[PDB]
Write a protein that binds this ligand. Sequence first.
Ligand code: TTP
Ligand code: MG
Length: 218
Amino acid sequence: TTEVVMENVTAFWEEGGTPVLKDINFKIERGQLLAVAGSTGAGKTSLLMMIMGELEPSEGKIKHSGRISFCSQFSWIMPGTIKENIIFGVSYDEYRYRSVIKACQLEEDISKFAEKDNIVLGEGGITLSGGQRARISLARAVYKDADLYLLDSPFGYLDVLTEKEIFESCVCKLMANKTRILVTSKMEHLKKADKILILHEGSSYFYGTFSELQNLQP
Ligand SMILES: Cc1cn([C@H]2C[C@H](O)[C@@H](COP(=O)(O)OP(=O)(O)OP(=O)(O)O)O2)c(=O)[nH]c1=O
Ligand SMILES: [Mg+2]
């Protein structure tokens, strides 16, 4: 019933360096949303890396099981069509694909190309905007079938309202039944999350709910 657990986790990127994560604690039940916030260098991406097994803890316990889909904070494209970039070697299903591109507002973009979903990216032709590349990268991660979705600041280059709309249509509605960790700073995302973890220089600045944090004000 619990999907991801960290208990008293401390970790280092360099032996004898300073810890990148210090005494971190959280729990996510199946289907819940954890928001992970904090300033640059706080350890948010490192926390995701530990879940993906690229960073081993020096102290503490970690629990998680199953396939992971990871959306990097650095959007990327490979040579191929926009459809191929989103499916990215996963089996194709029209309904699933269309649901994702609609939730990511990409249907609007794609409808304007004569080649539609067969427009070729990453081969010197179309030069995508930063917001387009971010929404394609998010769609790629969301299309993949996984037990756990790790979305590392996926709303790069998007204006406030577009970010809000895609957070609601993709992360909250399309992915409503999925276990999600979303690295984000935005107030509405923290308010909608089941739990919030705010990191500061590796430490747990706050862990709880948005309501609990409100109760602390005053
Ligand atoms: C991800 C990563 C971080 N680090 C170091 C860099 C930092 O000193 C520290 C924490 O880095 P990050 O985990 O990358 O911090 P962040 O993701 O919260 O920052 P941002 O909002 O800008 O994305 O770990 C490594 O040494 N190797 C790595 O692969
Ligand atoms: Mg990061």
